[PDB]
Design a protein around this nucleic acid. Structure first.
Lengths: 51, 73
DNA sequence: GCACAAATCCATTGACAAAAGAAGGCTAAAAGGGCA
DNA sequence: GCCCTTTTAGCCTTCTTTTGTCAATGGATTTGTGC
């Protein structure tokens, strides 16, 4: 994503920065979003959603 | 109490932990806090690691082992 | 304390499906001119 | 004013690509467990 950084790169650029292939990057980001979806990591973000 | 009435994937521990919970029918924290060291230890493929991480996480939430339930549901 | 016995986290590999561009044809405005 | 005409801008669907998506698979540690 574009968080605290310049242009958000695609999967291949993230892989070249991590020397890993794109599918590992997708698995890692999905892992992190799963980890963030539960409360204790979601209560504070979710209050930003008035929907 | 709200802490004992949440899912087993509530406190976000090891995947082996949740697998063993569903393998001993553990799905709610209400009786998960009902289980003591031996009762939890008896299970398959749940050795020191998973139960002791349960211990650490509930200690961070402060609760203890084997609390005797009434008003459940 | 030791030694085996799966459960399972880092990475491919293929096969694919859906944006994203790049383009080529059609509409379709839209200058622009010319007999008085 | 009147059409004729010539033109060009813009949308409008195909095709080629880039990028993401999904399923499987060693194999390494690791955790569990019997001794």
């Amino acid at each position: 994503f574009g968080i605290d950084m310049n242009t958000d790169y695609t999967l291949e650029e993230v892989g070249k920065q991590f020397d890993v292939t794109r599918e590992r990057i997708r698995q890692i980001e999905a892992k992190a979003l799963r980890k963030l979806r539960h409360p204790s990591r979601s209560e504070v973000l979710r209050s930003f959603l008035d929907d | 109490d709200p802490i004992l009435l949440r899912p087993v994937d509530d406190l976000e521990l090891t995947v082996r932990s949740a697998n063993c919970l569903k393998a001993e029918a553990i799905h709610y924290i209400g009786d998960l806090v009902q289980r003591t060291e031996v009762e939890l230890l008896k299970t398959p493929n749940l050795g020191k690691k998973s139960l002791t991480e349960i211990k650490d996480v509930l200690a961070s939430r402060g609760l203890s082992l084997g609390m005797r339930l009434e008003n459940w549901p």
